[PDB]
From Swiss-Prot, chains A, B:
Belongs to the cytochrome P450 family. InterPro entries: Cyt_P450, Cyt_P450_B, Cyt_P450_CS, Cyt_P450_sf. This is Cytochrome P450 130. GO terms for biological process: cholesterol catabolic process. Homodimer.
Length: 394, 394
C-alpha cells in the first residue's frame, strides 16, 4: 500500500514507498479515520517541515502527548507528573538543565568498556554456535545495561532491573504492574541512598541539585517519572537501530568492505545507519495556533505527526539516492534524535552502542547472513524495531 | 435481553432477568464467543454450585486470574508478584495469616467514629443543598478513607492517597501510571517507617512479622502488591453497596419505616442490602481437573465465572421472593464476600460503612428521592457500582 496508515508489526518491513508518496503528493497530509473522524490529524513527511516543526515548540506543543490518540494522557495516566518529553518550555527547561549534568562525554566514556566486553561475550557465543537470535542475545539486553548505567543502578542490580525493563518495554510498545511498581519502589530506595552517596549519574545529579529535598514529594515524583522516560526511551530505540542495521549491512558487501578496510570510517557509518533505521519513525505534537505550511493550514488544536523516518529519507535533503546505504555520505541534520528542545539526551550513548556493535560485528562475525523476510517486527506505530533477527555466521 | 453477556455500563441497570434465565434453564452455562471461540468459558449461576465452587480452591483455582480473559495475568503484568487474591493455598495461607492480624474487630472499631463524622458532614451538606450527587460527595471518598486506615496511612496523607486511589479505581474498572508509581513509591517510604514505628494496621503487622526483612525484596514487593489489592478491592465495591442500596430503599417506604421505627434492625438490613447489591457480581476461577456439576462436565483448563450476584438472588436458597427487599429476611450464606479461603478480609469494614451510612441517611435525610433511570453505572463486567446517583432531599 501507498496509502497512509499507522504502522503495525505486519507493515514495518517496508514503509518507505508510503513515505515517498506522502512526500511527493501530500506533504501536509490530513488523516480522517473513517470510524472516528473526530480523531483527525495531520502528517508531516518532508525534512524541511519536520525540521522546522520539531524546533518550533511554541507552535507544535508536546504537552498533550506524543501519539495521534487524543485521549493519550488520561489513557496512560500521565497528567499529574508529566514526563519531561511531554513538557514544554519553560517547565521543561530547568529539569532538562539539571538532568543534562548526567549526560556528558564522561558518562558515555565510563560505560564504553562494559558495553564492549558484553558485545564481545555475546558475539563470541553466537559465533561458536554458528549464529542465533542476535536480538534476544545482544541487541535487547545491551541497551538496558546502558540505561541502568545512566540511572546509577549498581551493576549488581542490572539483572533485576532488566527484568522490569523488559516488561515495561513490551507493555509500552503494543501491562507491567509488577514491574512498574517494583521499579518505582526500587528507585525510591536508590534516590534516598543518593542523598548521602551521590555519584555522577543523572539521578545523583537531580538529588544533589535538591530535586525532592525537604519533603518536596513532587520533586521526587519527577525523578521517578524520569526513570520511566529513560526505560521507555533508551531500550526499544537502540534495539531498532542495532537490529534494523543488520539487513542493510548484509545486503551491501561493498559497504562492509569500505569499513573492513577503513575501520576509522565507522563513526560516519553510524550516522548513516541512524538515518536509515530512524527507530523513532514518528512522534506527534499538538498545534497551539493555526499554522500554514505551503498550501495547507493546520488548525489549532490538532495532532501533527512528525515523520522523522520520512524526513530522514527525503530526497530533497539527501538526494535521489536517499533510500540507499552510503556509509561515506556523512548525512547532516538527521532527525533520528529530533531537533530542538527535546533533542535526545541519549544520542551520544546510542551512537556509542552502534559504533561498538558495528566494530565488533565486522571484527568477529564478518561472514554473516540475515534473512530479511524472517525478521519479526514489534507492534506499535511509533518505534520500528525487530523482536527477532535470525542471524547466521560461518 | 435474557441471553448471557458480560455486563457493560449500559446493561448494569437490570441483569436480574438474564441471571434468572441462567439459573432456570442453563445453570452450568457454556459461553463460546463467536469472534474468539478459543476463549470459551463457563458460568455458574446457582447458589449451591457457586457456594461449593468458591470453597473448592483445589478444583477451582484463582492462580490464573479472576476474569474470563485467558490473557489476563500477562495483560496486567501480575505474574512475578501475584496478588493474594490470585494465589492458591498453600502459597496464599501464610500471607493471609499474617495480614489478617490487621483485620480484627479493633481495626473496624477504631475507624468507625471517623466514618460517622465524615458521613454526617457530607449528608448535612447535601441536606442544606436539597440534595446533590451522593456518589461524588460521599459514597466515593468514604471507602477510600477506610482503606487508608487499614493501610496505616496517616490521616494527614488521606487527601493525597485518595487522588491515587481514584485514578487506580477508574483504570481498574473499565491508565494510572503516575498514581500507581506515586503510590508504590509512597508505600516504600511508609514500609520503611513501620520498621521502627509499627502500628496496629496490616502493613505494620506484615513488617513486624519480618516480611521484607534483611534484603528480602520479594517480601517488600508482596506488601506493595497488597496495597494495590486493597485499593482495587475496597473502593468500587463499597461504592456499589452504598449507591446500589439507594434505589432499593427509595422504592420501599415500608422497609424504611421498619428501620425508622426500629433502628436496631439496621445490621440485619445491611445483610439484605449486601445480598441484593452484591457489588462483586462475579469473579472467575480456572478448573484444575474435569469437574461434573449436574449434567455438564467442565473440562480442566477453562475459566468458570462464579456469579455471586445470581447466587445471591437464587430462589432455591432465598425463596420465590429472592428478587425483593426484605430487611427482616436475615439472609444467611450470602456470597457477597465469596466463601472459603479468599473470603473478603474487608467484610466487617464494608458492613460497618453500610450500617453507618444507612443509620445516618434515615436520621438526617429521611425524606429523599432517587431517580433510578438517572443512575449512571460504571463500565466493567465484574463490579456493579454507580458513578452517579442523583439524590434529592426535602
Ligand atoms: C537510537 C536510539 C534512540 C533514538 C532513535 C532516540 C530518539 C529520541 C527522540 C526522537 C527524542 C525526542 C522525542 C520527541 O520528538 O518528542 C528523544 C528524547 C529522549 N531520549 Fe532518546 N533516543 C534513542 C536512545 C536513547 C537513549 C539510549 C537514552 C538514554 C540513555 C535516551 C533518552 C532520552 C531522553 C531522556 C529523552 C527526552 C529529552 C527531552 O524531552 O528533553 N534516548 N529520543
Ligand atoms: C461491599 C464491599 C466489598 C465486597 C462486595 C467485596 C468482595 C470481595 C470478594 C467477593 C472477595 C473474594 C474474591 C474472589 O472470589 O476471588 C474479596 C476479597 C478481598 N477483599 Fe473485599 N469486598 C468488599 C470490601 C472490601 C474492603 C472494604 C476491603 C479492605 C478494607 C476489602 C479487602 C479485600 C481483600 C484484601 C481481599 C482478598 C482476600 C484473599 O484473597 O484472601 N474488601 N472481597
Amino acid at each position: 500500500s501507498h496509502e497512509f496508515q499507522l504502522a503495525t508489526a505486519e507493515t514495518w518491513p517496508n514503509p518507505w514507498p508510503m513515505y515517498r508518496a506522502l512526500r511527493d503528493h501530500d506533504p501536509v497530509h490530513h488523516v480522517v479515520p473513517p470510524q472516528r473522524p473526530e480523531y483527525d490529524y495531520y502528517v508531516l513527511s518532508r525534512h524541511a517541515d519536520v525540521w522546522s516543526a520539531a524546533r518550533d515548540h511554541q507552535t507544535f506543543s508536546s504537552a498533550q502527548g506524543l501519539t495521534v490518540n487524543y485521549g493519550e494522557l488520561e489513557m496512560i495516566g500521565l497528567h499529574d507528573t508529566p514526563p519531561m518529553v511531554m513538557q514544554d518550555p519553560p517547565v521543561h527547561t530547568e529539569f532538562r538543565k539539571l538532568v543534562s549534568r548526567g549526560f556528558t562525554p564522561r558518562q558515555v566514556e565510563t560505560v564504553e568498556p562494559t558495553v564492549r566486553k558484553f558485545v564481545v561475550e555475546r558475539l563470541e557465543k553466537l559465533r561458536a554456535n554458528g549464529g542465533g537470535d542476535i536480538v534476544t542475545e545482544l541487541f535487547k539486553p545491551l541497551p538496558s545495561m546502558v540505561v541502568a548505567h545512566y540511572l546509577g543502578v549498581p551493576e549488581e542490580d542490572w539483572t533485576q532491573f532488566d527484568g522490569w525493563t523488559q516488561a515495561i518495554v513490551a507493555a509500552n510498545a503494543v501491562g507491567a504492574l509488577d514491574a512498574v511498581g517494583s521499579m518505582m519502589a526500587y528507585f525510591t530506595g536508590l534516590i534516598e541512598r543518593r542523598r548521602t552517596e551521590p555519584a555522577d549519574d543523572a539521578i545523583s545529579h537531580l538529588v544533589a541539585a535538591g530535586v525532592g529535598a525537604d519533603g518536596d514529594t513532587a520533586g521526587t515524583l519527577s525523578i521517578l517519572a524520569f526513570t520511566f522516560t529513560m526505560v521507555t526511551g533508551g531500550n526499544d530505540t537502540v534495539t531498532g537501530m542495532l537490529g534494523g542495521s543488520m539487513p542493510l549491512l548484509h545486503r551491501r558487501p561493498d559497504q562492509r568492505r569500505l569499513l573492513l578496510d577503513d575501520p576509522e570510517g565507522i563513526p560516519d557509518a553510524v550516522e548513516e545507519l541512524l538515518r536509515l533505521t530512524s527507530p523513532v519513525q514518528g512522534l506527534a505534537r499538538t498545534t497551539t495556533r493555526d499554522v500554514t505550511i505551503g498550501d495547507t493550514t493546520i488548525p489549532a488544536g490538532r495532532r501533527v505527526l512528525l515523520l522523522y523516518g520520512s524526513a530522514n529519507r527525503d530526497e530533497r535533503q539527501y538526494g535521489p539516492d536517499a533510500a540507499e546505504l552510503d556509509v561515506t555520505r556523512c548525512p547532516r541534520n538527521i532527525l533520528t534524535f529530533s531537533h530542538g528542545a527535546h533533542h535526545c539526551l541519549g544520542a551520544a550513548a546510542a551512537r556509542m552502542q552502534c559504533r561498538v556493535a558495528l566494530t565488533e560485528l565486522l571484527a568477529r562475525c564478518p561472514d554473516f547472513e540475515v534473512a530479511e523476510s524472517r525478521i519479526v517486527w514489534s507492534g506499535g506505530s511509533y518505534v520500528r524495531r525487530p523482536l527477532s533477527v535470525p542471524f547466521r555466521v560461518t
